[PDB]
Protein backbone atom coordinates (compact mmCIF):
# COMPACT_ATOMS: atom_id res chain seq x y z
CA UNK A 1 0.00 0.00 0.00
CA UNK A 2 0.95 3.67 -0.19
CA UNK A 3 1.24 3.87 3.61
CA UNK A 4 3.69 0.94 3.57
CA UNK A 5 5.83 2.46 0.81
CA UNK A 6 5.95 5.71 2.83
CA UNK A 7 7.15 3.67 5.82
CA UNK A 8 10.02 2.11 3.87
CA UNK A 9 10.91 5.49 2.38
CA UNK A 10 11.23 6.99 5.88
CA UNK A 11 13.46 4.05 6.85
CA UNK A 12 15.73 4.72 3.85
CA UNK A 13 16.02 8.41 4.77
CA UNK A 14 16.90 7.46 8.35
CA UNK A 15 19.49 4.87 7.24
CA UNK A 16 21.16 7.28 4.80
CA UNK A 17 21.49 9.82 7.59
CA UNK A 18 23.01 7.32 10.05
CA UNK A 19 25.36 5.94 7.39
CA UNK A 20 26.55 9.43 6.43
CA UNK A 21 27.32 10.20 10.07
CA UNK A 22 29.42 7.03 10.33
CA UNK A 23 31.20 7.64 7.02
CA UNK A 24 32.42 11.16 7.89
CA UNK A 25 33.85 10.03 11.26
CA UNK A 26 37.66 10.01 10.90
CA UNK A 27 37.91 6.81 12.97
CA UNK A 28 35.92 4.87 10.39
CA UNK A 29 37.66 5.89 7.18
CA UNK A 30 39.10 2.35 6.90
CA UNK A 31 35.50 1.14 6.45
CA UNK A 32 34.27 3.66 3.87
CA UNK A 33 35.38 1.90 0.67
CA UNK A 34 35.93 -1.71 -0.44
CA UNK A 35 39.32 -3.35 0.01
CA UNK A 36 41.42 -3.27 -3.20
CA UNK A 37 42.70 -6.71 -4.30
CA UNK A 38 45.95 -5.21 -5.59
CA UNK A 39 46.60 -3.23 -2.41
CA UNK A 40 45.64 -6.24 -0.25
CA UNK A 41 45.90 -9.68 -1.91
CA UNK A 42 45.36 -11.95 1.11
CA UNK A 43 42.05 -10.31 2.08
CA UNK A 44 39.86 -12.76 0.14
CA UNK A 45 41.77 -15.67 1.71
CA UNK A 46 40.02 -14.74 4.96
CA UNK A 47 36.93 -12.68 4.03
CA UNK A 48 34.27 -14.22 1.78
CA UNK A 49 31.55 -11.54 2.11
CA UNK A 50 33.12 -8.07 1.99
CA UNK A 51 31.14 -5.11 3.25
CA UNK A 52 31.81 -1.38 3.63
CA UNK A 53 29.85 1.82 4.13
CA UNK A 54 29.77 2.76 0.43
CA UNK A 55 28.24 -0.65 -0.33
CA UNK A 56 25.71 -0.04 2.45
CA UNK A 57 24.68 3.24 0.78
CA UNK A 58 24.21 1.43 -2.54
CA UNK A 59 22.05 -1.22 -0.85
CA UNK A 60 19.86 1.42 0.82
CA UNK A 61 19.18 2.97 -2.58
CA UNK A 62 18.46 -0.46 -4.10
CA UNK A 63 15.78 -0.95 -1.40
CA UNK A 64 17.62 -3.95 0.08
CA UNK A 65 16.93 -2.94 3.71
CA UNK A 66 13.30 -3.25 4.80
CA UNK A 67 14.09 -3.23 8.55
CA UNK A 68 16.77 -1.74 10.77
CA UNK A 69 17.73 -5.34 11.61
CA UNK A 70 18.57 -5.96 7.94
CA UNK A 71 20.79 -2.86 8.02
CA UNK A 72 22.50 -3.75 11.30
CA UNK A 73 23.33 -7.19 9.89
CA UNK A 74 25.56 -5.44 7.35
CA UNK A 75 27.02 -3.09 9.99
CA UNK A 76 27.81 -6.20 12.04
CA UNK A 77 29.40 -7.77 8.95
CA UNK A 78 31.75 -4.80 8.50
CA UNK A 79 32.79 -5.26 12.13
CA UNK A 80 33.10 -9.05 12.12
CA UNK A 81 35.09 -9.02 8.86
CA UNK A 82 37.51 -6.51 10.40
CA UNK A 83 37.93 -8.64 13.53
CA UNK A 84 38.59 -11.79 11.50
CA UNK A 85 41.11 -10.14 9.18
CA UNK A 86 42.87 -8.46 12.16
CA UNK A 87 43.16 -11.11 14.88
CA UNK A 88 46.81 -10.71 15.94
CA UNK A 89 48.58 -8.60 18.56
CA UNK A 90 50.17 -6.35 15.89
CA UNK A 91 49.36 -2.68 16.64
CA UNK A 92 47.86 -2.30 13.17
CA UNK A 93 45.47 -5.17 13.90
CA UNK A 94 44.61 -3.80 17.33
CA UNK A 95 43.84 -0.32 15.99
CA UNK A 96 41.48 -1.65 13.33
CA UNK A 97 39.75 -3.92 15.88
CA UNK A 98 39.22 -0.91 18.16
CA UNK A 99 37.73 1.12 15.32
CA UNK A 100 35.58 -1.78 14.15
CA UNK A 101 34.01 -2.21 17.59
CA UNK A 102 33.54 1.55 17.86
CA UNK A 103 31.72 1.60 14.49
CA UNK A 104 29.34 -1.15 15.62
CA UNK A 105 28.76 0.43 19.04
CA UNK A 106 28.18 3.86 17.50
CA UNK A 107 25.65 2.56 14.95
CA UNK A 108 23.72 0.62 17.60
CA UNK A 109 23.72 3.62 19.95
CA UNK A 110 22.40 6.04 17.32
CA UNK A 111 19.60 3.63 16.46
CA UNK A 112 18.71 3.00 20.11
CA UNK A 113 18.49 6.74 20.77
CA UNK A 114 16.88 7.92 17.53
CA UNK A 115 14.73 5.19 15.91
CA UNK A 116 11.28 4.79 17.43
CA UNK A 117 10.67 1.18 18.48
CA UNK A 118 7.13 1.26 17.07
CA UNK A 119 8.48 2.49 13.73
CA UNK A 120 10.89 -0.44 13.58
CA UNK A 121 8.13 -2.86 14.63
CA UNK A 122 5.94 -1.62 11.77
CA UNK A 123 8.78 -2.20 9.28
CA UNK A 124 9.14 -5.76 10.56
CA UNK A 125 5.42 -6.49 10.34
CA UNK A 126 5.21 -5.22 6.74
CA UNK A 127 8.25 -7.33 5.81
CA UNK A 128 6.74 -10.38 7.52
CA UNK A 129 3.53 -9.94 5.48
CA UNK A 130 5.41 -10.16 2.16
C1 LIG B 1 40.91 -2.48 21.52
C2 LIG B 1 40.80 -3.73 20.69
O1 LIG B 1 41.72 -4.02 19.92
C3 LIG B 1 39.74 -4.55 20.87
N1 LIG B 1 39.93 -5.82 20.47
C4 LIG B 1 38.88 -6.63 20.63
N2 LIG B 1 38.96 -7.92 20.29
C5 LIG B 1 37.88 -8.71 20.11
O2 LIG B 1 36.70 -8.37 20.21
C6 LIG B 1 38.27 -10.11 19.76
C7 LIG B 1 37.55 -10.75 20.89
N3 LIG B 1 38.42 -11.47 21.84
C8 LIG B 1 39.79 -10.95 21.79
C9 LIG B 1 40.31 -11.16 20.38
N4 LIG B 1 39.18 -11.17 19.43
S1 LIG B 1 37.64 -5.78 21.33
C10 LIG B 1 38.50 -4.30 21.38
C11 LIG B 1 37.96 -3.17 21.89
C12 LIG B 1 38.02 -2.94 23.27
N5 LIG B 1 37.48 -1.77 23.83
C13 LIG B 1 36.86 -0.82 22.99
C14 LIG B 1 36.80 -1.04 21.62
N6 LIG B 1 36.21 -0.12 20.83
C15 LIG B 1 37.35 -2.21 21.08
C1 LIG C 1 39.35 -3.35 5.99
C2 LIG C 1 40.43 -3.94 6.91
O1 LIG C 1 40.06 -4.71 7.79
C3 LIG C 1 41.75 -3.69 6.75
N1 LIG C 1 42.54 -4.30 7.66
C4 LIG C 1 43.86 -4.11 7.55
N2 LIG C 1 44.73 -4.69 8.39
C5 LIG C 1 46.07 -4.62 8.22
O2 LIG C 1 46.65 -3.97 7.34
C6 LIG C 1 46.89 -5.43 9.22
C7 LIG C 1 46.74 -6.91 8.87
N3 LIG C 1 47.58 -7.75 9.74
C8 LIG C 1 48.98 -7.32 9.60
C9 LIG C 1 49.14 -5.87 9.98
N4 LIG C 1 48.30 -5.02 9.12
S1 LIG C 1 44.12 -3.11 6.25
C10 LIG C 1 42.46 -2.94 5.85
C11 LIG C 1 42.11 -2.22 4.76
C12 LIG C 1 42.74 -2.56 3.57
N5 LIG C 1 42.45 -1.88 2.37
C13 LIG C 1 41.53 -0.84 2.36
C14 LIG C 1 40.90 -0.49 3.55
N6 LIG C 1 40.01 0.50 3.55
C15 LIG C 1 41.20 -1.17 4.73
- What ligand species are in this complex? the ligand CC(=O)c1nc(NC(=O)[C@@H]2CNCCN2)sc1-c1cncc(N)c1, the ligand CC(=O)c1nc(NC(=O)[C@H]2CNCCN2)sc1-c1cncc(N)c1
Record field, number of beta strands: 0
Helix-strand string:
HHHHHH
Query: Into which percent range does the helicity of residues fall?
Result: 55-70%
By CATH, the superfamily comes out as Bromodomain-like
The main sheet comes to: none
CATH architecture group name: Up-down Bundle
Shape: elongated
Supply the helix-strand structural class. Answer: mainly alpha
N-C termini distance: 12 Å
Number of domains: 1
Number of helices: 6
Strand content: under 5%
PDB class: cytosolic protein
Keywords: Bromodomain, atad2, inhibitor, complex, cytosolic protein
Assembly: monomeric
Entry title: The ATAD2 bromodomain in complex with compound 12
Could you please describe the fold and organization of this structure?
The protein is mainly α and 130 residues long. It has one domain (1-130): Bromodomain-like (Histone Acetyltransferase, Chain A, Up-down Bundle). It is built from 6 helices and no strands. The protein has helices at residues 2-23, 43-46, 53-61, 68-85, 91-114, 117-128. The chain is elongated and about 50 Å long. It binds the ligand CC(=O)c1nc(NC(=O)[C@@H]2CNCCN2)sc1-c1cncc(N)c1 and ligand G1E. The ligand CC(=O)c1nc(NC(=O)[C@@H]2CNCCN2)sc1-c1cncc(N)c1 binds next to helix 5.
Topology of helices and strands:
Blueprint: H1 2-23, H2 43-46, H3 53-61, H4 68-85, H5 91-114, H6 117-128
Bound molecules: the ligand CC(=O)c1nc(NC(=O)[C@@H]2CNCCN2)sc1-c1cncc(N)c1 and the ligand CC(=O)c1nc(NC(=O)[C@H]2CNCCN2)sc1-c1cncc(N)c1.
Residues 30, 33, 35, 39-40, 82, 85-86, 90, 92-93, 96 line the site of ligand G1E.
Amino acid sequence: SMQEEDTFRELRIFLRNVTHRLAIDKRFRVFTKPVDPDEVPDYVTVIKQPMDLSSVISKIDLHKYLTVKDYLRDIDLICSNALEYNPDRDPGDRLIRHRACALRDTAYAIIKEELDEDFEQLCEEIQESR
